[PDB]
Amino acid sequence: MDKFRVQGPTRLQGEVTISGAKNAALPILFAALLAEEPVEIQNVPKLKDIDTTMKLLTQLGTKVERXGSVWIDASNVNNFSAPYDLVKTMRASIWALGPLVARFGQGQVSLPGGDAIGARPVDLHIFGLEKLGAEIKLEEGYVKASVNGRLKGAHIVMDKVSVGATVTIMSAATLAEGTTIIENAAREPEIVDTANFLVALGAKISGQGTDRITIEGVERLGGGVYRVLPDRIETGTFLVAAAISGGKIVCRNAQPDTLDAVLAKLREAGADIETGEDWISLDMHGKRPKAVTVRTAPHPAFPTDMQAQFTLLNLVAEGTGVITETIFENRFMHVPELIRMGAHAEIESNTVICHGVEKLSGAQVMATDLRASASLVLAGCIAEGTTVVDRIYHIDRGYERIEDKLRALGANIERVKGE
Amino acid sequence: MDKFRVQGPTRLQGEVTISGAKNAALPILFAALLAEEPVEIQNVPKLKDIDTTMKLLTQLGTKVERXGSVWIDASNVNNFSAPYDLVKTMRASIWALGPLVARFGQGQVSLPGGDAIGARPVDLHIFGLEKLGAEIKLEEGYVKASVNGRLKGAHIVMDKVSVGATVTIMSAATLAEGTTIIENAAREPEIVDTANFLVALGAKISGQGTDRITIEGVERLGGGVYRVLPDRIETGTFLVAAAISGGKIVCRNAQPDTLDAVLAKLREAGADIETGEDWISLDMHGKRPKAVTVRTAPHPAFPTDMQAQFTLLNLVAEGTGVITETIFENRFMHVPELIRMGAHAEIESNTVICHGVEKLSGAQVMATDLRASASLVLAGCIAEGTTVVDRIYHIDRGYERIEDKLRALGANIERVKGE
Amino acid sequence: MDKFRVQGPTRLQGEVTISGAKNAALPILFAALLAEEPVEIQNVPKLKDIDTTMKLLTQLGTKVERXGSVWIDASNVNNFSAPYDLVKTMRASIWALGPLVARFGQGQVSLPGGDAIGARPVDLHIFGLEKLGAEIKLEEGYVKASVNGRLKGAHIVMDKVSVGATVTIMSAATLAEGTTIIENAAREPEIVDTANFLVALGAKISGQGTDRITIEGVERLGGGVYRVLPDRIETGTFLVAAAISGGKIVCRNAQPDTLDAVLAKLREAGADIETGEDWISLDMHGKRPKAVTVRTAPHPAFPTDMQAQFTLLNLVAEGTGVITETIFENRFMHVPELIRMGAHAEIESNTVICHGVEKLSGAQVMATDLRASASLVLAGCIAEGTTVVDRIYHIDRGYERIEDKLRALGANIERVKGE
Amino acid sequence: MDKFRVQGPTRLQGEVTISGAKNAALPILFAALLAEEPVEIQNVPKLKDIDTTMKLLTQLGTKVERXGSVWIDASNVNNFSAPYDLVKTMRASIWALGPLVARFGQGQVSLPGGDAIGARPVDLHIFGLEKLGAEIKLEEGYVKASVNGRLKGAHIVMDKVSVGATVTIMSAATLAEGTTIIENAAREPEIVDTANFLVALGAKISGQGTDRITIEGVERLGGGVYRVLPDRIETGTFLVAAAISGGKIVCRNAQPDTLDAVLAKLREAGADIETGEDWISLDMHGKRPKAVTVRTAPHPAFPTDMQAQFTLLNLVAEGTGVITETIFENRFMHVPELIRMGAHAEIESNTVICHGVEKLSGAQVMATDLRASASLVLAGCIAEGTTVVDRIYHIDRGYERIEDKLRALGANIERVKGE
Ligand SMILES: CC(=O)N[C@H]1[C@@H](OP(=O)(O)OP(=O)(O)OC[C@H]2O[C@@H](n3ccc(=O)[nH]c3=O)[C@H](O)[C@@H]2O)O[C@H](CO)[C@@H](O)[C@@H]1O
Ligand SMILES: CC(=O)N[C@H]1[C@@H](OP(=O)(O)OP(=O)(O)OC[C@H]2O[C@@H](n3ccc(=O)[nH]c3=O)[C@H](O)[C@@H]2O)O[C@H](CO)[C@@H](O)[C@@H]1O
Ligand SMILES: CC(=O)N[C@H]1[C@@H](OP(=O)(O)OP(=O)(O)OC[C@H]2O[C@@H](n3ccc(=O)[nH]c3=O)[C@H](O)[C@@H]2O)O[C@H](CO)[C@@H](O)[C@@H]1O
Numbered sequence A, B, C, D: 001m002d003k004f005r006v007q008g009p010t011r012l013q014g015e016v017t018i019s020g021a022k023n024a025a026l027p028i029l030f031a032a033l034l035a036e037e038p039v040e041i042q043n044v045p046k047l048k049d050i051d052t053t054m055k056l057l058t059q060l061g062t063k064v065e066r067x068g069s070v071w072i073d074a075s076n077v078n079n080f081s082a083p084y085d086l087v088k089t090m091r092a093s094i095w096a097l098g099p100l101v102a103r104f105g106q107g108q109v110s111l112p113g114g115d116a117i118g119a120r121p122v123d124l125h126i127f128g129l130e131k132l133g134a135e136i137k138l139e140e141g142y143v144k145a146s147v148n149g150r151l152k153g154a155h156i157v158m159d160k161v162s163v164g165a166t167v168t169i170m171s172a173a174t175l176a177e178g179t180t181i182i183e184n185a186a187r188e189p190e191i192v193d194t195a196n197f198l199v200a201l202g203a204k205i206s207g208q209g210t211d212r213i214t215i216e217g218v219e220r221l222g223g224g225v226y227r228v229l230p231d232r233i234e235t236g237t238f239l240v241a242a243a244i245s246g247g248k249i250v251c252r253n254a255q256p257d258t259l260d261a262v263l264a265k266l267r268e269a270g271a272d273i274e275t276g277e278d279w280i281s282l283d284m285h286g287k288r289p290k291a292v293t294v295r296t297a298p299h300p301a302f303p304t305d306m307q308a309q310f311t312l313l314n315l316v317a318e319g320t321g322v323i324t325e326t327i328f329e330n331r332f333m334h335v336p337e338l339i340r341m342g343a344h345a346e347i348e349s350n351t352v353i354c355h356g357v358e359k360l361s362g363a364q365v366m367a368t369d370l371r372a373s374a375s376l377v378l379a380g381c382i383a384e385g386t387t388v389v390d391r392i393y394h395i396d397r398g399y400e401r402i403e404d405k406l407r408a409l410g411a412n413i414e415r416v417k418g419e
């Protein structure tokens, strides 16, 4: 396994260019399964998740190719199954379900198992599909779906807010008979992006971005060219990178409107933030960040994807911070790792109390999940001495060349195919 | 002191006309503090809470009078405070805050104390105001706010979804200099209703009903005529009345689109439902309800105000149901009371596991919650023998003559005064 | 209703004599139901709760008289039921259950309803009796028990650590045919106190105070005289009164060994402590307390009955404090009351995060818990100006003359007759 | 990286011998560090952890060798540190801390990070040692302890019931100056076990098994011969194995009173059990298990180590069943895996509602926990079809030849390897 070897303390400063959103590219790649014509998705970051998606798409009899773009030829889809291998590697493989059943009348996907950060059930996906008129059964650990002819429009109310289930139900409804109404739908920028992608293809959708999505079924989906939005989570991680290192920074290729809460939290931290129409600028004035209070919740509130990062920010901040996590059950893995580094913290249920310390100490830590890994990398950057982050493979699923981007910021980092 | 005597088991069936929403009439009644001209609010239910707002209003130097409607004249407001006594009996009293300091540059409201259901801080209200330029301080239990001149519109991202704080900020913003953007705003129907009422007065509002409300501060508010929307909770309660009694019912004067989550849940419990534009039809077909799973959350998800009612539904349903509460948490007072009647249930944190039973037994129970404890009267209706619900002043707070409506559905119930 | 008018701030200094424990007196009074001959219980505090138990005993046909002692003659008990009204005034009434069935083969108690601090089910009580051979049915809110012949000893492993259930099962077992083992029994000092009492009556018990209590049933219990232990919560509460007021105090007629957790906690808050066989001295050296961390759990861990008091301590302590409640998840009524007084806290589920402030301010607050009540009176002592605590009926239930005790310490406190 | 291959449905029945308990051998093996004369530890199971423990022992400069028993020679203990690699592969490595600082005046151990089942902080181990006078610092991920001369005994009250912290403080105190008192100590059979081992070495200990452990510091410890006690968890796992299958079983070298809670639950599940001073016999009578309720708490209540095992039982049992976990935050990993097998389960916070299903289908699943692992395997042992369990290394951590044992019990299990 690769590892990162980092040395600090180090002031993170400079310019950085945001990559396409991991969370927009994924659901759009799966949506392409609905397209009968050549498709061109632009601004797709290079990630292990995209690789696994191209690999899975190919397995489905799809024609895939990439650079900054990813060329998709879904005209010939031949197989209808996502093997245990793929789902195991990438949860998002569940996304092939809706499109497959909507276009082909059948589809199978290995029932995901527990996750690093939570049980992560797909109950809502299956449920939405059933509402759409698909027959679903569990066999050999396989979620078996099928429908006779076309899916049927329906008024579906979501139990809880789910990004993934909204993508799943939204996607399949595009090809169904009638009108679909997804109530209590996720408002995530990536939901909007995926809906727009679907509309580019000839779908009838409205309300994307609000708690209510209306879809009018159409005979088929063509093809086109779509540019995935900027990654709000990568952007956030960089703003933070600067905010905890007394540095300054400018984010090129960003979409400020997707991160209001994060920006508000940064300001509450004592950050000097300014925004353009495609750029964000943060300045710490050499100052130490102030502790803030954080409560994760669905968009546009504070995203759970920024959580590990904010904890880090609280850990080297002046004051006592409190972080409450409402989306994921086991999303504190980063904490004990940071303590190993000299941070003071206490966990109580779904909340962690942060007692800011002046400086961090280099140590050997373990990446457990993607966004915590990026938190550990950032911790290494500011901590004293050497920090080695084991299992940086997590980082590589959701981050495109993070070592390089950090390096350009003045980071002392080496990817090590060691020990 | 007021008590309900109920005899069952009794099949609930017939017709019912839904009154005006308590939760829409309250905030509109306080927003009236902004109008410099005679205002008439139509379709106001006759509730103890409405009497209290009237009382609070009068003491502000306000001209108030009611019947079907409530006549308001706030051109002469001289007193700027909500006393301890009123805030005690009536929590919504805090709503006087925003309008007062927006309109007169000042306001005082007693800080609400302990609440059985979950404790309920108003941090969000205060914070919101402060974001608008108001200076706030705590004195002798009173939240004191003031502003030199006019409030300044701001970009406010809510830490959490708050019906109350949203109304406070939305209301006050109508009179500020500039634009106010409320991100992560509550989507409640009563919010659309209050925004609409504010516009009827001369306010510039948009986004009401979505997570992003925009307010263009205007110079002053006039007066007008506005009809309060139907009561969604009262509707669901009656719907549940039929669903738990093998009954059949028709709701007249309803606004179906405000209760999709409740309609969907009911369907899941085996109910045959149909809707028109101002009516809702429910039929159990003599059927005992099917256990279901509930998760309260912000609108349009499952409403915490329907919670105790659904716990009842679960308690006498086939199978094991689960009620999880994310808004109030300690909102399970009805449970032990129902266990007094034969129900089988365990409370684990913010969740109640429901073990459905065939029959309930009449017994003496205690009302405590203004919406929860209508559940005890519903339970009385279908329970074996005689049930006495003490302290019915609770139901009188949120339910307009519930015994008259129940009686017309075929219930054996009598309001025994004093004892 | 009665009330407390308190004026501060006031440093709490002096001596106090600890009363007999409310919590040992109660179960011992109920156990006296098993005695065939006159019984004398010494050191019984004068409390509303003792009044109520006396009333209940009398209704059963018990002969009861009191001063410092309580005189009992249960030789001619003729009635076997605890009525709705009694149980509603004081839940300990459920304690009549076990002794009635074991001795008379029959017993009826009104099923306790919802509680302020938590649902407080009595499933373990009922279950344990059933394990001993009692037949039990729920009729009109009454837990009707009966045992064809004589109770039978059984091996009982408790699902949860329960003071109430351990007392009920233990009392009943004394008259059971055979042997009874209570595995995972509560270790509360009061459990030990009640067990010695039973022994003094001729019962065969051992293990009291440890995880497994063994009871060798006997044909009959006679009479005797028993001296109740000192009230640990009263003791802890006075300790807190000095630890939060930079004062000094000595407790007379105390039992240090029953409060090690509280003592250790106090030390951490920076208190100078000394103890002897029957006394405890607390010296804050004029110092403000250091925020501490608290986790309620079964004895000998930190007692949930000291919880609200430590919350108060954290509230005026230096630093950020954390209070976690594992016995009663809703035991936070006092927090918002304290917030009304200038305190700074956030409630996250079963945990309250305390941010110590320099001073508190007088305000009108409402008592609710026969323990937060005390906390509010303490806060009044150290707060700036005038504090009024409504509903002090609560205090009277758990504290014997708390105003004279405080008064003797320097407290400016007056009992107002309603206004 | 091997993986079990399983096939069913198979009826588990017959006779199995119980190995030494993993939980006693470990801390006992660590207490060895104190023994000046060769010690012979008996009944030690062949476990990955036992090997890793020996490896760790060796590194400190200790003679270690084994078979059925382990030989230790702490005579020439030269080295003072636990290496990152060891602490990483085995958390229990923190155990070497008390012995090192007690016996050698110094001791360093790599700070454990996050755990599979939860954060698992060692705050109590550290805080305790400090009560003993040890100076402790964190440097480079290393917990650094040292003491000027000898550890002074002190009165210590445990914030929480920690088995590990109870072993560490008890162990270190055996060589302390004066008497040590551990209040609110863990009561686990493994503490009784370890305490006995320590006394056997010439140390003064009492209270072991109760909530109060008293230690009188002695001048030094020597050798001896000690036999570890029977593995309660293994016994429970086997008893369950035989209960979920409808079979019969008999455990050898069992010690029944270490598991009263598990036994009673099995009876609630309708299983015919009998005990003898040495052995345990479970007979399902070909009957299917009955859904039960479970709450994990410290010994003697239901152990968390039997949690996953009981979820399985509930999963394939008649009716719904509830399981609540109070010891570990993230201990439901096995659930999603189980669902992959066709089980109906809902997770709510720290509670899992188990909907008993008639049958389980073979499927590929992932072992994650050294306790759930056994759960998946058992699941296969009764599932219709073929089941492959990945990363079965977990089993090897606390399971001596479990495939062998299961096979003797009539199971279709094969340890596939390679790939
Ligand atoms: C590839 C991708 O887009 N990943 C993002 C997506 O994941 P993901 O799509 O999994 O997010 P969801 O919003 O669906 O999950 C949120 C909550 O809903 C629960 N749930 C979800 C679906 C279901 O059928 N049943 C159910 O119980 C979850 O287990 C969790 O407790 O949204 C998360 C929340 O912003 C982000 O943190 C992830 O980075
Ligand atoms: C008069 C009225 O219309 N009452 C309704 C309104 O009350 P209310 O306005 O009080 O509802 P909120 O939406 O504000 O409260 C929701 C959640 O937010 C928390 N919170 C709220 C405000 C704040 O400043 N800080 C904070 O932490 C609460 O304590 C709770 O945990 O919405 C509730 C939820 O839909 C309904 O059940 C009430 O019947
Ligand atoms: C009159 C008296 O002596 N009162 C004390 C006693 O009350 P009480 O006897 O009610 O205390 P319990 O120990 O039984 O209750 C503790 C926990 O067990 C639960 N539980 C209890 C019984 C049962 O059958 N089922 C069940 O689930 C409770 O609801 C709670 O979650 O112990 C409490 C905890 O030390 C103290 O705060 C009370 O002041």
Ligand SMILES: CC(=O)N[C@H]1[C@@H](OP(=O)(O)OP(=O)(O)OC[C@H]2O[C@@H](n3ccc(=O)[nH]c3=O)[C@H](O)[C@@H]2O)O[C@H](CO)[C@@H](O)[C@@H]1O
Residues within 6 Å of the ligand: D023, D026, D092, D118, D119, D120, D121, D122, D123, D124, D125, D126, D160, D161, D162, D163, D164, D165, D186, D303, D304, D305, D327, D328, D329
């Ligand atoms: C090798 C061994 O003997 N393992 C057992 C031991 O582990 P372990 O020794 O780790 O068990 P603990 O009793 O210490 O842990 C119990 C609870 O206390 C907490 N805690 C503990 C120590 C501390 O310093 N701080 C703290 O917060 C824990 O993180 C957990 O929430 O007991 C557990 C509980 O029966 C078993 O499931 C483990 O199989």
